[PDB]
């Protein structure tokens, strides 16, 4: 056992390793979405910037969790990162809704991790999660809500002008 | 009786207290409107900016009359700040129209003060209303009229595109 | 129902709405205190500055709570802001004593609000209160108790010198 | 008759000359008060600089009215500047209460002058009094009232320590 390990239950260790996988998965979904909007037949390059930047942020989330795992004396076990559920994301509003849906899954997973950490009386782990993940799930979910709503009210996905104007004025 | 009081009728002091409660109420309406446009199913960030600024500006008006109450030797007596009429403001256009109605009422009230203070031969009080309040109201009314007109022409409130663009290109 | 709402209970949404009102009321109490010390027969700029600053901070607390409500997908419902209890706050010491009382009641509301968030397993809400509200109350309470201590030891409210010199040296 | 007179009554010219004389008198009262506090047996150096400042402001008020008299085409007529009622002003608190009484008398004089300008329908002479003299009198009376109030609670005039600290912290 690790000379640093203190108050770090192996269920919390197991859960952090599968949160690490979900954060890498999330980053890969976003990578897929970003380069979808790069396509010459979609061509929304602020949608592409937006999802690429969320792709990088979600990789920082993974490494933070991996750093946490070593800080606490657990051992990273990496898993396959599954390909995203869709090669084709259909529209800007559809990707935004898929992202909002992904972000709610990721957040549900973080709420479970926190419930477990709470059950395991790991206040450093709870604080770690509250400090670095919980509010930025709320913030990202709220921001995608904002985005989904404006896109709908602008007349997406049926309107091509809606996704264009949103791309320049909200995402530029 | 106040050692500074001079030519300050008890009727003007009571009227000043009433206007203070109007200005606080106006502040509260605008606060209400602002965080409506911050909802995830309205999501108009600069409509929300605009009204929150108005709310702070109204709070300045209230405080300036309380300064005046004291400068003249009157005594401040505050009342309840009633909640605004609506919790839901329907749309950007309807909010602007409500705000336009509220400004004309506040103007009505200030013109009544001025009239009273004329009746009571209070030339310093008449100049105070004129210098700090009356032309602020003509400006605010003329602005909300400008906004109300533009949103109507753009096709608000049926057209979600209209309010989206107005928020970016006028309230931004 | 709201597309961003996740793990946000009805009960917690109601409390936030009540806390918004309490913060608004405390902003109003401090404003009443501010212009009491602006009076010609009271005359203490620094008590009045101190309290106006607190009125404005409390206004900021109330707005961050409305930002949260929207962030989490709940709905703000504003109510009347009650007038404060006193019109004459008697003395600088007595205002400091009532301000201390107000801050402890607001803390009681925040502690109860945090406890409900625990009960509903809202770890994000819990973190929100800890970060922005709980230590603010503990500092605000300690500062106010320090002020009452010095005002009493100086001879207040009997001594007009006591309060005059505190106004210059502590609040300057 | 002056090539520049228009809507300027014989009575208004005469009341301006009366007001010039009053401002010169008030400057002369403050100068007397100034060097009372410069005496080796009063020795309140900031009371003296305060009242020399007031004395010089009053000299500027008189000059502004002489400039107005010539702006409207009326003719300046100077009278004796009577000596102040007092050579000995007894105490700083006493000098302030007397100053308060002076600025209320000069105010009542300016209110009667604005009433006359109204009587004669001189909107320029009215606004001149409003812009330049009315709010200054309201502020001078309030500030003196504040000083009188603080001196009293501090224990003036029986407390020489009070007048000394007042001179340091308020007036220095
Ligand atoms: Fe994440
Ligand atoms: Fe106003
Ligand atoms: Fe607070
Ligand atoms: Fe003067």
Author numbering:
A (entry chain K), B (entry chain B), C (entry chain C), D (entry chain I): 5 to 176
What does the paper say about this structure?
In order to achieve the proof‐of‐concept objectives, we chose a 24‐mer human H‐chain ferritin (HuHF) nanocage as starting materials; subsequently its original Asp residues nearby the C3 symmetry axes were mutated into Phe, and the resulting mutant is referred to as 3FF.
Therefore, to elucidate effects of ionic strength on the assembly behavior of 3FF molecules in solution, we fixed pH at 9.5 and carried out a broader screen of salt concentration (>200 mm NaCl). Excitingly, 3FF molecules self‐assembled into 2D equilateral‐hexagon‐like crystalline protein arrays in a solution (2.0 µm of 3FF, 20 mm CAPS, pH 9.5, 800 mm NaCl) upon incubation for 1 h, whereas wide‐type HuHF and other mutants could not form such arrays with identical experimental conditions, demonstrating that our designed π−π interactions play a key role in the above self‐assembly process. Consistent with our design, each 3FF molecule keeps interaction with eight other molecules along the C3 axes through the Phe‐mediated π−π interactions in the crystals. However, different from the aforementioned 3D and 1D assembles, the intermolecular π−π interactions responsible for the formation of the crystals are composed of two kinds of interactions (intralayer and interlayer interactions), demonstrating another kind of anisotropic π−π interactions for 3FF assembly in response to different external stimuli (pH 9.5, 800 mm of NaCl). Joint I corresponds to two identical T‐shape π−π interactions, while joint II is composed of a pair of offset stacked π−π interaction. Calculated results demonstrate that the intralayer interaction owns the highest binding affinity, largest buried surface area and the shortest distance between two C3 pores, suggesting that the intralayer interaction is the main driven force for the equilateral‐hexagon‐like morphology of the 2D crystalline lattices. What most interests us about this 2D crystalline lattice is that anisotropic Phe‐Phe interactions enable 3FF molecules to pack preferentially in the ab‐plane, finally producing equilateral‐hexagon‐like crystals. The strong planar π‐interactions could enhance the growth of monomers along the hexagonal layer in the ab‐plane, so the 2D sheets observed under fast nucleation conditions were equilateral‐hexagon.
